[PDB]
Design an enzyme around this catalytic site. Structure first.
Site, short mmCIF file in Angstrom:
data_model
loop_
_atom_site.label_atom_id
_atom_site.label_comp_id
_atom_site.label_asym_id
_atom_site.label_seq_id
_atom_site.Cartn_x
_atom_site.Cartn_y
_atom_site.Cartn_z
N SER A 112 10.22 52.56 35.25
CA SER A 112 10.22 53.66 36.22
C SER A 112 9.63 54.95 35.66
O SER A 112 9.00 55.72 36.40
CB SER A 112 11.65 53.92 36.70
OG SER A 112 12.53 54.14 35.60
N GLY A 113 9.82 55.19 34.37
CA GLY A 113 9.31 56.39 33.72
C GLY A 113 7.81 56.39 33.44
O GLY A 113 7.22 57.45 33.20
N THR A 169 13.93 53.28 33.07
CA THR A 169 13.36 52.65 31.83
C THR A 169 11.93 53.12 31.59
O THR A 169 11.14 53.22 32.53
CB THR A 169 13.39 51.11 31.92
OG1 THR A 169 14.75 50.65 31.87
CG2 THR A 169 12.62 50.46 30.77
N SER A 170 11.63 53.43 30.34
CA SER A 170 10.28 53.77 29.91
C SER A 170 9.93 52.89 28.71
O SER A 170 10.54 53.02 27.65
CB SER A 170 10.19 55.24 29.52
OG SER A 170 10.51 56.08 30.62
N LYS A 225 15.94 47.76 24.05
CA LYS A 225 15.06 47.11 25.02
C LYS A 225 13.90 46.38 24.34
O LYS A 225 13.10 45.72 25.02
CB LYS A 225 14.52 48.16 25.99
CG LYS A 225 15.62 48.89 26.74
CD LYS A 225 15.09 49.93 27.70
CE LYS A 225 16.24 50.64 28.40
NZ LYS A 225 15.74 51.66 29.36
#
Ligand SMILES: [Cl-]
Ligand SMILES: [Mg+2]
Ligand SMILES: [Mg+2]
Ligand SMILES: [Mg+2]
Ligand SMILES: [Mg+2]
Lengths: 204, 243, 250, 241, 228, 231, 244, 196, 195
Positions: free
Chosen positions: H129-130, H1-2, H33
């Protein structure tokens, strides 16, 4: 250690033409030790038959529980419970213990008194219903029973032909299982007569 | 009859006599007032000096809720304290969850629902106080008055207690003579006068004046007690007007 | 707070009467007439939609209620008491039966559950009895068609035909003369409409009369196809037009 | 005679505490009216500010329960706010649990059930209020559902509540007898508000200034109350024809 | 030792509604317990539910929410919405922190329109035009990603759905036997098409295993009393 | 009359009769006097015996090293309320390393007594208390009524014939407030104050009870021959 | 508070009587008469339905006679709704016992349990008592055929022949007159119906106004059979005994 | 996910990728999201999908009930409600939420609530995470009081790089713009952002 | 605890139970009676975890004695064994289960039959002609299978029991310090004081 294979045993049920059959071995053991050769695993409440494999204390407990419940059912409903209805009662009762289950493999067999339709059903320890047309198997030799039933079974067998099929399915499955055997019983069930037959088998 | 013997019982009129009897306890109490000014509110109360043995300035009546709300009441003093204690819990839980200090209208309903709840059952007694309260929030100044029934409204000026009729008449003059508004420092002076004028209904004993205020310019929107020179100035102004 | 009424509000008087139950029955007596008639191939339940105001939309007020697909209910007495009983009756049909047996309860057993709820309001602490009498019509596989009356005491009785509320005494006499064990459902509906006309003062039409039946399975009302054993609800509420059609053959 | 003090049956099968709660309903001496348009539901209520020391902006008996639902109350303000807070809580909970906005009729039924409980349970008194819920429901369209202290509720084409409800009710009845439709056949809510105010004037035989009225309007996806200046614009249009 | 069956379950949106499909194999470990189970369930008349994972949990959770949906429908005098079933399912599943191993595709029609969701055991939900679940989800999704397009007709969506199920049947060992389909179109009754395809018919056996009568040795016979 | 059956019922004039009847129990109680200067605070209490064989009922209770009270009315209620004060004084010391302010102690007593005046089933407390203490703002004297009303005073008296002592303290106000750094003279003033409430009986060695707290004086109670010096 | 409205259902009178129990017994004295007669070869339960209607569905109706298990039945006199609450509790107790011991519950143990439940409502809880009197007809292998009665006080007693409900004084005198120890079921059937016929407040005793049951070892061999009589079967026994 | 949220002159913009993975399998390649808790208060979700959905649904309920009683909530208030749920239930939650909103009094505001349940008011925030791969890029390229078009480019370029390097991120870049003018949704496809 | 044996003959039930109590390293007692009389014609022997064995047995004993007084009646061996089974079946899903295995030897005065029930700590009940718990059956059942007859006298049962104990004393590693033997018949319960 595994609760479903401490005591051992098997149940099988089959449908035929205007009839059902349910059968079980008679062994109760403590792992390798044979303890009883008269431990019957099939019970009945009116015309509905219930076979139960697995942990023997739970087999006894559930029989007492379903006798309890079907007796109250009858007093209130003013009629005997039917196989379809009882199947749902077994499922409900097992799932209420979802996170502390009875370690059993129940099998229902019977003929609906109004429609005359033959009925069988199976359950996992937690209440999931298997409603097969042909046959239901349960116990420590279920793999062996699946193999026997799949090859031996054919639809619309007459009561006395169904007896031979289910008997041979049980016997030869049990002889390939250390924790099953020590005698066997077969119920042949018709709309208004039920015959019970004890089978001759090897006692090792 | 017998409808007035138990709380939460509707009379054939549709009245709750126990609540109406609680009002009698309020009417028996000392005079307390509230004045809404340009950027805040001013609270004042009459404190009857029963005896010379009372320590001056010690028996404080006006109470703070959070840091921006002031509360004053007439009637049974313990009932008022109980209500403020609840208000402080309400304000704390509001700020805990929503971060921002409780808005005055929000706070008003919290007290209102609580007081109203004590008119729903015969196992509790209605509050024997009318409470004048308010302060400054993000939308500006607010002044409220809350009755034993749980009924409350917003006010320009408010009065309760034994000299409420006198006070109300004085407040009504200020509203008429100042449509543009009143300054915080003016309101403190006027509050002192009105309590002194309302003291005619309690003329037997002498009294002590107590004033507090929340003002955006004068107190940074925080509740503070009027003390020392500012209090004496208000007392002098009041004494000059009665003579 | 806390409910501090933990004692019974219904008690035996010196004469052996349970006052609050008798008074609840008096409230039922003041209520608008409702009736039920059992036929060989169905049951009919009917009542008058006594509209409190002509500005009120009386279609939004349901005096006849579906409890299960095969069971319906009508009342006489206090409407709000009926409404909450219908909510409880619907739920108890699931919680104490369908979630256990995977099927809807038979009429007599649902009636028994409703009766138990009404009995408890007659003995439990800090409550009054329900001010309604219910007429519950239904069908199930093993008992066939049935009609039951439930009173504020919790007592229930099975009927071939009956009436409750305002003009029940005259209506029951009217039903006694007309009822036989060979009635078809359409005959019972005809008799219901005749009986109900006597107790109605003003307008008598499909908009002022509420009528439902327990009859044949309605596969058109099921909402889905594909499962042969599922054939649809036996409870059906007659439309305003359907009532008026039968009022011409009256 | 304690059958008059708590909610138990009298010998006649009556609940006197419920009947006396209906009488408390008129204690404010305020009349309210609700009507339905094509795309809207309008509710108007008398506004009386008898004290000059009051802040008139805080004197209200109309409540914004949810985005879509509005509620006017006939009865004392403490009980009114009690009902308002509960209705707001119920509407918010409904949306959280069931994933869609609570319908007006469903909220009415819920509040009616809560009222019914007070008529059956002895420890709880009835609320001395009549609640008129309004919205433009996404399924049923313009909706008026009214609840009372007996726990009774029903949908309305139009309705009136207060000391002079009968005069308003008959006036409304006579109009719908002429038009033969269940609503005010008008496109804009502004004109439906004008209809509502006009017929209240006719029925009560009194004129209104901008501060004598209180107005709530329900449209698709929102309920809102009109300001004094919005009402003034309405009153001007009424006078100019 | 509870049942966790292999499955291929899919959902596909089309012009005037939504379709869901499933295979008909129930597994016990490597053993095929039921060769023709029904994985398509009802929640309400026009809302249907395909389930995978722990078999007992999928059935139990679908029936519980279906029960509460019926009571909610009666209470509100309204036809039940898919978002209600979705919200009730996910809040139930989330409360048990994944210990109820129910993985579902929910699909149906209601006054708001046609809907297609997926629900995961831990309580997360997803929206989509095409979805797949089960041990054969990757085989099915490969077909859906290859052939799915916008503005599918009824007959095209049924073809795509059943093709996705077939990919699971042949390539996934957990899935097999037949293809069930349920079509839910707006303004029409939902049509359940039990055993829509039956491409795995058992061939004739080489020999009959009907025994001569008397083959089995018997020790005791006795008439059982079922009557009162 | 019809409105005195319980504490949850107002009268038509807005009175709470059960609270008033509880107040009446204090008036039947034996006289006790409180007074203070700027350095010390003193309690003087006339103890009451049942008869000549009996002991004289103790009137003064220590709550902490810096605080204590005297009682008039139902003694078991004073024990409940003084126990509560002990706990609150103790909570303040343990949790905050802070001696409980006398004014805050009064607020706590008010609120505890109030809950018994607004709820069904309970009853008001049937005792009056005079709390003395020395904290961070000097000497203090409080008067507690079971109505919930707590008042900070220079001097006061409660119990039977307390009006005589109260008038004396009202006259002597300007004198006794100035008795700083002289414990014996402050007690003398208190003993002279309580003497204005005596009839037929006089202050004996087992009759008199005195307590004192101050700047460098922990709360200490004097009984027996320790008060003969002041007789 | 709430005390004002409390009737105090569990208090003694100055004479040492329980008001509510006494008034509940007064209520039961207006209920339809129920009669139990114990014979050497079985038990008879006979009971009169209260002023019925021609439109009442009799064949599906049950207000008097109820089955607790296969061995034990009850006849009810009083509030039917109150009785059903207790009956369901009794049915559960019987099953609890059967599950625990794997034997049918002895008649007296069941009777004592229900009677203790009734007793509790007279001593604690502040609730009204159950306005019900039971006649218990049952069989077990310890005492054989047994008749008991219980009333709202929770007191129970054993009987050879007993009546509850309306006109018990007249009924009990008639039973006491014609009952003998060596009596048989068929004789007891006749006595019960003759007693009801004389004590009834109705003009005549007909099948539609009666509920009837027998507990017999007239079940093929070493077992017991309960027989709840059908409307036609009640009509036949009325003709057989010469009442209609 | 970013995920990220960036304040600018006219308000605030939220950005996110659309990839949801179960291990290496992309369970949903078109995930949304960016979630709405109030009209002009939105949030970006990272961590457990079940947890963040549950939290968001509860917050939406709380702000709906807040609005009925007290009128429109501030962005700070929304962030406080998020924090209360995240902090008090930190032992049972895996949730990293960025809260972004537009007031008329306060304008565009961004609050980040990392794993522990702390709150941090920032000019812009990045998470998922990105985000690790664009700390350098974002810190070098962010300016305060950017225009709408500049902020869209900044987010598009930032999330493009996050997607490029992070296997757990991918699909489309979704954006939601919060200003006085209203609420605008934007979407950008791979063929657009991959060539940047 | 260790060895407990049971044998149902023609007219009686015989229970044999070891006398040793071993706490790890040392044999603390060699005369321990691992049995409780539940009613005049019902005896229960027990073996399992320390403390729980006696606590369970005495708890059962108290309950049967209570029933006996309340009803003025002795429960059948079948009824007692069912009650005991339920308690153990209840116990196995408790917070801390009773780790107790029991044999119930009773004489049914109604049927005039001896009855032996074997129940383990899970609540696994079986009615048997002869039974054991633990490893006792492994050594003894082959002898019992061979010699047992349903028409055996009490004296023949005791002789077959002696052969079983001798085989145990030969092939078991543990010294169980002999057995206490009790007989349950129509006249009640008695102990064989020389074995
Ligand atoms: Cl509700
Ligand atoms: Mg074998
Ligand atoms: Mg072997
Ligand atoms: Mg009430
Ligand atoms: Mg990538």
């Amino acid at each position: 250690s595994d609760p479903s294979s401490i005591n051992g045993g098997i149940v099988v049920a089959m449908t035929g033409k205007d009839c059902v059959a349910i059968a079980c071995d008679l062994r109760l053991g403590s792992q390798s030790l044979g303890v009883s050769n008269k431990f019957e695993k099939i019970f009945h409440y009116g015309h509905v038959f219930l076979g139960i494999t697995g942990l023997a204390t739970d087999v006894t407990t559930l029989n007492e529980m379903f006798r309890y419940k079907t007796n109250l059912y009858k007093l209130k409903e003013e009629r005997a419970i039917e196989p379809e209805t009882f199947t749902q009662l077994v499922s409900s009762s097992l799932y209420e213990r979802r996170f502390g289950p009875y370690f059993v493999g129940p099998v229902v067999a019977g003929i609906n008194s109004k429609s005359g339709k033959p009925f069988i059903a199976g359950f996992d320890l937690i209440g999931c219903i298997d409603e097969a047309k042909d046959f239901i198997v349960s116990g420590t030799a279920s793999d062996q029973l699946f193999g026997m039933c799949e090859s031996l079974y054919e639809p619309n067998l007459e009561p006395e032909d169904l007896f031979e099929t289910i008997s041979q399915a049980l016997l030869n499955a049990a002889d390939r299982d250390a924790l099953s055997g020590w005698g066997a019983v077969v119920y042949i069930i018709k709309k208004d007569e039920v015959v019970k037959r004890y089978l001759k088998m090897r006692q090792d | 009859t017998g409808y007035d013997l138990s709380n939460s019982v509707f009379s054939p009129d549709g009245r709750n006599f126990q609540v109406e009897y609680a009002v009698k306890a309020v009417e028996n109490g000392t005079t307390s007032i509230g004045i809404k000014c340009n950027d805040g509110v001013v609270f004042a109360v009459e404190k009857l000096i029963t005896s010379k043995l009372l320590v001056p300035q010690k028996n404080v009546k006006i109470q703070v809720v959070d840091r921006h709300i002031g509360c004053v009441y007439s009637g049974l003093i313990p009932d008022g304290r109980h209500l403020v204690n609840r208000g402080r819990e309400e304000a704390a839980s509001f700020k805990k969850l929503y971060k921002t200090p409780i808005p005055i209208p929000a706070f008003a309903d919290r007290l209102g629902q609580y007081v109203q709840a004590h008119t729903l059952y015969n196992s509790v007694r209605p509050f024997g106080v009318s409470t004048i309260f308010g302060g400054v929030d993000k939308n500006g100044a607010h002044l409220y008055m809350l009755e034993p029934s749980g009924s409350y409204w917003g006010y320009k000026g408010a009065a309760t207690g034994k000299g409420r009729q006198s006070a109300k008449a004085e407040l009504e003059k200020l509203v008429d003579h100042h449509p543009e508004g009143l300054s915080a420092r003016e309101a403190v002076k006027q509050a002192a006068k009105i309590i002194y004028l309302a003291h005619e209904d309690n003329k037997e004993k002498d009294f002590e004046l107590e004033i507090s205020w929340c003002s955006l310019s004068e107190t940074n929107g925080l509740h503070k007690f009027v003390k020392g020179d500012l209090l004496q100035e208000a007392i002098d102004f009041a004494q000059k007007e009665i003579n | 707070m806390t409910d501090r009424y933990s004692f019974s509000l219904t008690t035996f008087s010196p004469s052996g009467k349970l006052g609050q139950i008798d008074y609840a029955l008096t409230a039922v007596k003041q209520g608008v007439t409702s009736l039920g008639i059992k036929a060989t191939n169905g049951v009919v339940i009917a009542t008058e939609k006594k509209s409190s105001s002509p500005l009120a939309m009386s279609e939004t007020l349901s005096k006849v209620s579906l409890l299960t697909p095969d069971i319906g209910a009508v009342y006489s007495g206090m409407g709000p008491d009926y409404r909450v009983l219908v909510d409880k009756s619907r739920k108890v049909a699931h919680t104490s039966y369908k979630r256990i047996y995977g099927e809807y309860p038979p009429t007599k057993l649902l009636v028994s559950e409703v009766a138990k709820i009404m009995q408890e309001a007659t003995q439990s602490g800090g409550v009054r009895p329900f001010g309604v009498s219910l007429l519950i019509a239904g069908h199930d596989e093993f008992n066939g068609f049935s009609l039951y009356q439930v009173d504020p005491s919790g007592s229930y009785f099975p009927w071939k035909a009956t009436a409750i509320g305002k003009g029940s005494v005259a209506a029951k006499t009217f039903l006694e003369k007309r009822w036989n064990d060979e009635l078809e459902l359409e005959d019972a509906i005809h008799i219901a409409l005749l009986t109900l006309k006597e107790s109605v003062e003003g307008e008598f039409n499909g908009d002022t009369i509420e009528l439902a039946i327990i009859g044949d399975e309605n596969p058109d009302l099921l909402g889905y196809t594909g499962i042969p054993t599922d054939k649809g609800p036996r409870f059906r509420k007659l439309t305003s037009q359907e009532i008026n059609d039968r009022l011409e053959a009256l | 005679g304690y059958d008059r003090h708590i909610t138990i049956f009298s010998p006649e099968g009556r609940l006197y505490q419920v009947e006396y709660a209906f009488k408390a309903t008129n204690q404010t001496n305020i009349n309210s009216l609700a009507v339905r348009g094509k795309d809207c539901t309008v509710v108007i209520s008398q506004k009386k500010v008898p004290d000059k020391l009051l802040d008139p902006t805080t004197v209200s008996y109309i409540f914004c329960i949810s985005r879509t639902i509005g509620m006017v109350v006939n009865g004392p303000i403490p009980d009114a706010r009690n009902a308002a807070l509960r209705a707001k809580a119920e509407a918010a909970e409904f949306r959280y649990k069931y994933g869609y906005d609570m319908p007006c009729d469903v909220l009415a039924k819920r509040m009616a059930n809560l009222s019914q409980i007070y008529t059956q349970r002895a420890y709880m008194r009835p609320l001395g209020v009549i609640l008129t819920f309004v919205s433009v429901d996404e399924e049923l369209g313009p909706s008026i559902y009214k609840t009372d202290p007996a726990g009774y509720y029903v949908g309305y084409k139009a309705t009136a509540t207060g000391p002079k409800q009968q005069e308003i009710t008959t006036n409304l009845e006579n109009h719908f007898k002429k038009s033969k439709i269940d609503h005010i056949n008008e496109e804009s809510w502004e004109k439906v508000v004008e209809f509502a105010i006009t017929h209240m004037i006719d029925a009560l035989g009194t004129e209104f200034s901008k501060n004598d009225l209180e107005v709530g309007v329900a449209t698709k996806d929102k309920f809102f109350t009109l300001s004094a200046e919005n009402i003034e614009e309405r009153l001007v249009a009424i006078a100019e024809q | 030792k509870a049942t966790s069956t292999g499955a291929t379950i899919v959902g596909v949106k089309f012009n005037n509604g939504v379709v869901i499909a499933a295979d008909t194999r129930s597994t016990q470990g490597p053993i095929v317990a039921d060769k023709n189970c029904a994985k398509l369930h009802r929640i309400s008349p026009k809302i249907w539910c395909a389930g995978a994972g722990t078999a007992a949990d999928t059935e139990a959770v679908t029936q519980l929410i279906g029960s509460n949906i019926e009571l909610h429908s009666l209470y509100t005098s309204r036809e039940p919405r898919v978002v209600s079933a979705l919200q009730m399912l996910k809040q139930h599943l989330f409360k048990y922190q994944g210990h109820i191993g129910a993985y579902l595709i929910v699909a149906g029609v209601d006054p708001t329109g046609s809907h297609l969701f997926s629900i995961h055991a831990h309580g997360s939900t997803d929206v989509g035009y095409y979805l797949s679940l089960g041990s054969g989800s990757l085989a099915a999704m490969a077909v859906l990603e290859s052939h799915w397009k916008q503005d599918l007709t009824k007959e095209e969506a049924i073809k795509l759905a059943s093709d996705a199920i077939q990919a699971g049947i042949w390539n996934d060992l957990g899935s097999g036997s037949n293809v069930d389909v349920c079509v839910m179109e707006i303004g029409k009754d939902a049509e359940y098409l039990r055993n829509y395809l039956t491409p795995n018919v058992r061939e004739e056996k080489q020999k009959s295993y009907k025994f001569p009568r008397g083959t089995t040795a018997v020790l005791k016979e006795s008439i059982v009393n079922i009557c009162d | 009359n019809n409105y005195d059956g319980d504490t949850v019922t107002f009268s038509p004039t807005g009175r709470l009769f059960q609270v008033e009847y509880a107040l009446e129990a204090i008036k039947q109680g034996s006289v006790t006097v409180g007074l203070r200067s700027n350095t010390h605070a003193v309690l003087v209490a006339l103890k009451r015996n049942a008869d000549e064989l009996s002991s004289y009922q103790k009137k003064i209770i220590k709550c902490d090293e810096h605080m204590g009270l005297s009682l008039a009315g139902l003694a078991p209620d004073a024990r409940v309320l003084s126990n509560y004060l002990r706990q609150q004084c103790n909570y303040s010391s343990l949790v905050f390393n802070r001696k409980l302010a006398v004014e805050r102690a009064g607020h706590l007593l008010c609120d505890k007594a109030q809950k018994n005046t607004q709820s069904y089933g309970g009853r008001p407390y049937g005792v009056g208390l005079l709390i003395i203490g020395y904290d961070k703002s000097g000497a203090h004297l409080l008067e507690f009524q079971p109505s919930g009303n707590v008042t900070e005073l220079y001097g006061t008296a409660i119990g039977a014939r307390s009006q005589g002592a109260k008038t004396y303290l009202e006259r002597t106000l300007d004198t006794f407030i100035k008795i700083d750094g002289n414990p014996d003279e402050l007690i003398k003033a208190g003993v002279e104050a309580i003497s204005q409430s005596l009839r037929d009986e006089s202050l004996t060695v087992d009759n008199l009870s005195i307590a004192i707290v101050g700047k460098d004086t922990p709360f200490t109670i004097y009984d027996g021959e320790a008060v003969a010096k002041y007789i | 508070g709430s005390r004002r409205y409390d009737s105090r259902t569990t208090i003694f009178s100055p004479e040492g009587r329980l008001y509510q129990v006494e008034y509940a017994l007064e209520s039961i004295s207006h209920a339809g008469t129920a009669i139990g007669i114990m014979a050497s070869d079985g038990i008879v339960l006979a009971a009169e339905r209260k002023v019925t209607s021609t439109l009442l569905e009799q064949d599906t109706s049950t207000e008097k006679l109820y089955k607790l298990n296969d061995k034990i039945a009850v006849a009810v006199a009083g509030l039917t709704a109150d009785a059903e609450i207790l009956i369901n509790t009794a049915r559960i107790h019987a099953q609890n016992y059967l599950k625990t011991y794997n034997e049918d519950i002895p008649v007296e143990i069941l009777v004592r349990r229900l009677s203790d439940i009734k007793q509790g409502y007279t001593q604690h809880g502040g609730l009204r008592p159950f306005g019900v009197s039971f006649i218990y007809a049952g069989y077990d292998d310890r005492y054989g055929y047994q008749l008991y009665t219980s009333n709202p006080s929770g007191n129970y007693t054993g009987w050879k022949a007993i009546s509850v409900g309306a006109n018990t004084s007249a009924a009990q005198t008639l039973l006491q007159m014609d009952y003998k120890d060596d009596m048989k079921v068929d004789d007891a059937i006749e006595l019960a119906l003759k007693t009801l016929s004389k004590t009834t407040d109705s003009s005549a005793l007909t099948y539609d106004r009666l509920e009837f049951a027998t507990i017999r070892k007239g079940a093929n061999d070493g077992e017991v059979y309960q027989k709840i009589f059908k409307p036609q079967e009640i009509k036949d026994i009325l003709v057989k005994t010469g009442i209609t | 996910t970013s995920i990220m949220a960036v304040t600018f002159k006219d308000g605030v913009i939220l950005g996110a990728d659309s990839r949801t993975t179960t291990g290496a399998y992309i369970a949903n390649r078109v995930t949304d999201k960016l979630t709405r808790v109030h009209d002009k208060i939105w949030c970006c979700r990272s961590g457990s999908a079940a947890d963040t959905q549950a939290i968001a649904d509860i917050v939406q309920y709380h702000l709906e009930l807040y609005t009925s009683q007290y009128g429109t909530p501030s962005t700070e208030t929304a962030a406080s409600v998020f924090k209360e749920l995240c902090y008090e239930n930190k032992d049972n939650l895996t949730a990293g939420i960025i809260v972004a909103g537009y007031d008329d009094k306060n304008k565009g505001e961004v609050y980040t609530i990392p794993l522990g349940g702390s709150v941090h008011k920032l000019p812009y925030a990045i998470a998922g995470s990105g985000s690790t791969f664009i700390y350098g890029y974002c810190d070098k390229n962010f300016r305060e009081n950017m225009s709408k078009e500049e902020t869209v480019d900044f987010i598009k370029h930032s999330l493009s790089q996050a997607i490029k390097w992070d296997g757990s991120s991918g699909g489309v870049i979704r954006m939601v713009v919060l200003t006085a003018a209203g609420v605008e949704r934007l979407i950008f496809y791979p063929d657009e952002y991959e060539q940047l | 605890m260790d060895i407990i044996l049971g044998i149902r003959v023609q007219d009686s039930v015989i229970l044999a139970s070891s006398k040793a109590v071993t706490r790890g390293i040392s044999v603390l007692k060699d005369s321990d009676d691992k049995t409780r009389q539940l009613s005049p014609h019902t005896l229960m022997s027990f073996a399992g975890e320390a403390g729980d064995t006696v606590q369970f047995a005495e708890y059962i004993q108290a309950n049967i004695q209570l029933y006996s007084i309340r009803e003025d009646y002795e429960l059948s061996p079948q009824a007692v064994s069912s009650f005991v089974r339920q308690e153990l079946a209840k116990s196995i899903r408790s917070r801390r289960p009773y780790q107790v295995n029991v044999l119930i030897g009773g004489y049914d005065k109604k049927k005039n039959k001896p009855e032996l029930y074997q129940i383990d700590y899970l609540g696994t009940k079986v009615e048997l002609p002869y039974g054991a718990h633990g490893y006792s059956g492994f050594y003894t059942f082959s002898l019992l299978d061979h010699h047992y007859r349903p028409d055996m006298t009490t004296e023949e049962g005791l002789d077959l029991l002696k052969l079983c104990v001798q085989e145990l004393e030969k092939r078991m590693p543990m010294d169980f310090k002999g057995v206490i033997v009790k007989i349950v018949d129509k006249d009640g319960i008695r102990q064989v004081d020389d074995f």
